Amino acid sequence: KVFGRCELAAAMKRHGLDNYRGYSLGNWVCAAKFESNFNTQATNRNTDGSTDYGILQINSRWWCNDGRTPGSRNLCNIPCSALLSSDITASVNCAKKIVSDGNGMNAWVAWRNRCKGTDVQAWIRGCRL
Ligand SMILES: [Cl-]
Ligand code: NA
Ligand SMILES: [Ru+3]
Numbered sequence: 001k002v003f004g005r006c007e008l009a010a011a012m013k014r015h016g017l018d019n020y021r022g023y024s025l026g027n028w029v030c031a032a033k034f035e036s037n038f039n040t041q042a043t044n045r046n047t048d049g050s051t052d053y054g055i056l057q058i059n060s061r062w063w064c065n066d067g068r069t070p071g072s073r074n075l076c077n078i079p080c081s082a083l084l085s086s087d088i089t090a091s092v093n094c095a096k097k098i099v100s101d102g103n104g105m106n107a108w109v110a111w112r113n114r115c116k117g118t119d120v121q122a123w124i125r126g127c128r129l
Contacts, residue, residue, distance in 0.1 A: 001086035003038040003055070005029065006127035008088075013129055015092040021099045025129070026120035027111065028095075032056055033123065034110035040091075041084050054083030054091045056108065063094055 003011070009029050012018070018025035035057035036042035044052045050061040050069045060069040064080035076094035083091050098107050105111045 001040045003032075003040070005033070005038065005123065006129075008032060008038055008055070009124050009127045009129055011088055012092065015089065017092060017095070020096060021104060023099065023105055024120060026123040027105060027115060028056075029123040030115035030118070030120045031105065031108045031111040034114045035108060040086055040088065043084070051080065053080045054085075055088055056083075056091050056095050057110070058083050058091060058094050058098065063098060 009025055012028050013025055017028045032038055032055050035052075036055045038055065040055050042054065042057065044057065046052060046059070048061065050059050050072065051066055052059050053064060053066070058064060058076070060066040060080050061072045063074070063076045064078050064083060065074040066080040076097060078090055078094065083094065099105055101107065105116070
């Protein structure tokens with residue numbers, strides 16, 4: 001599913017990401033924009049042999065099982081294909097664990113490099129939330 005910007009904002013808000021660990025909704029929308037282009041089906045293989053999955057590009061080294069990532073963990077206790085669903089529940093629940101792990105939203109490289117320190121409120125402009 002390719003979400004609209006405000007469509008995704010409403011869903012993320014609906015699932016309690018606004019202000020989760022102190023990160024405003026616009027941070028999460030911006031992260032999704034630059035991680036996945038708002039596409040739940042996005043997958044990207046990493047140099048380390050892991051793959052990132054879904055709207056928030058969650059990693060098979062630590063967070064989900066894809067059967068092809070050696071020595072990895074599955075700390076969200078899910079097949080990585082769950083992160084590609086049109087229903088973002090699994091991605092959100094897993095993201096809450098990731099952002100709680102110590103480095104906050106720095107776990108998302110596209111957030112750090114493209115959202116952090118920017119006017120992230122812009123990402124929810126025009127949305128009825
Ligand atoms: Cl933090
Ligand atoms: Na894994
Ligand atoms: Ru840790």
